[PDB]
Symmetry: D2
Subunit: 191 residues, 4 copies
């Protein structure tokens, strides 16, 4: 079982390196920083196994899983997301290998931009390329998604319809808040 913890060591180190890197973006800006804060997480073994058994994964290719390592970048404004995206695409300390835009959204109201990078981790024995998922979200998107995640866990994937209807209303309310915020930003920018 520490074969697991030995397997996850590079993923954890990739996340810590990328956290300090991405947090440097906001520091460099202190005008308006396009990043409010940054979090990162390596998937717990249980959650790796559960998803592997839910999506057809024999345990020998789990290394194909794109989100064992994950970061989340939270932005104040919707337009900040495109800015962060472009910064990430320009970085030379990793390469972007995949992306998908749920901002351009899901049936329940999930809003988030995803990309996956291949991070060239320097190890004791040389280089190891590890997949790291990076999501970019507004604060309001992140708030809604966090609640949805908690409810799906609490109800084991079967949220009762009365709660699901309200969750869907909350996603629209979060979306409207982001729209009003966008109007504020655009109006300030017509400087």
């Amino acid at each position: 079982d520490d074969k697991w913890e030995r397997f996850l060591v590079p993923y954890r180190q990739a996340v810590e390196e990328l956290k300090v890197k991405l947090k440097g973006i906001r520091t460099l800006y202190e005008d308006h920083s396009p990043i409010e804060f940054v979090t990162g997480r390596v998937k717990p073994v249980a959650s790796i196994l559960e998803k592997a058994r839910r999506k057809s994964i024999p345990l020998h290719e789990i290394e194909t899983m794109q989100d064992i390592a994950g970061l989340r970048i939270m932005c104040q404004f919707v337009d900040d997301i495109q800015i962060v995206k472009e910064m990430l695409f320009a970085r030379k300390d990793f390469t972007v290998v995949d992306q998908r835009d749920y901002i351009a959204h899901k049936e329940s109201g999930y809003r988030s931009y995803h990309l996956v990078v291949l991070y060239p981790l320097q190890t004791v024995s040389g280089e190891k390329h590890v997949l790291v998922e990076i999501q970019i979200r507004t604060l309001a998107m992140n708030f809604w998604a966090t609640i949805e995640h908690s409810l799906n866990y609490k109800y084991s994937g079967n949220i009762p319809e009365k709660v699901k209807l309200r969750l869907q209303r909350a996603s629209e309310a979060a979306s409207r808040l982001d729209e009003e915020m966008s109007e504020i930003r655009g109006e300030v920018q017509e400087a």
Copy 2:
């Protein structure tokens, strides 16, 4: 002004001590693992510039700065409106400081800081807000800064609209929470 950096030392330490304390609440829950009434905690000591400036707009003599309740400040952000009362009650029950005032919900605590030369009781303001309110409030504060306290009418309208949208979001979240708890 090294006079300043020395004056602010206790305030900064009180904030760091209180941050680790309050962040421990969430930790206590999420082993548990049910719902933490705290989502996150931030803290800041007011910059020398902003202390002086506020001192001069409500007419405060330089020997009366230590009376200011918000040189040191923390902010506690909660998911749900109902969490705010839960956090409030937790803070009133803690024995490692005393609550001396209250009125976003804010309270002020007196923190018995241990220093090398003995004790120093320092005032620290604690604001408790929902995430949605914090988001609006951060933008309002920034605009108030950018426009030096006189926000233009075309921006203030949009800020009011954002405030209403934040309110609607908190209301839906509250309804979600209300449905879940009657389990």
Copy 3:
């Protein structure tokens, strides 16, 4: 096994709170000489708790009496800094000192034990926390001694044991020359 990590939660939080407090001392000083160089803290792993419980025959219902489930280490530059730190700790009002032992007066270290009034969700929990105060040279020697004793399962060969003893004497002489540097400057 989930019972264990819930049991250790208060110990971890006590350590994190004490670390930030004790690191504040150096901050308060930094112009002058800080009696503290750095601060570390650790909660003993369940494995190590159980094993010590079995060597000093502690019923699992009595483990909470163990003084070093939670531990901090304070490292100082000079031997004289240790007395200064000791006095600071005895004067603090955010905990109470309940025990101490001085191996400075080849293992060298000062130990004390405090009772920390941890604020929890359900009220107060008083937790025992061991605080060791050491010079850098002392901590270095003790760290090596601990590692070897682990590698050799408590039975260090005589050829390694002789060198470890000479090393503790070298560490002690290093501290002595450092003390003389301090004693002279101080005689300003």
Copy 4:
């Protein structure tokens, strides 16, 4: 003076990124003996850059040629670890080594190398020089003290204090020698 802190921002970020990288080495090892005990990093204060800026003949036009505005220190338990860390650093591909100087071979002992770190910024890449020193714990202790004394006495320690500092460097060296023999003995497994 705000030009100073904008100037130092990349240096600070380079140090923070390299700290997390180098601290990952020990983690990777824990199980086994880590050749690294701990890692610190520092950007030089404006005052100290300027003072060094030409008591050592450097125009502020070319401050960036200074190799130690950004600095890291790697502390090892054993003298033999230093060579291991050195070889690890030369093998890394996330920077390039551009200079080195060896005082393992006043009583000062330390191995130095200088790397060029390709910092990703908002405006593209910035290559910054970062000095990395590798020291035993006992060496680092002594050097920390000398540096503090050199500050107290504005760069010329009086000799009655300097003599003892030399005796102290010799005491640290002897501690390292016994530890080396211990390491040297255990490995003969």
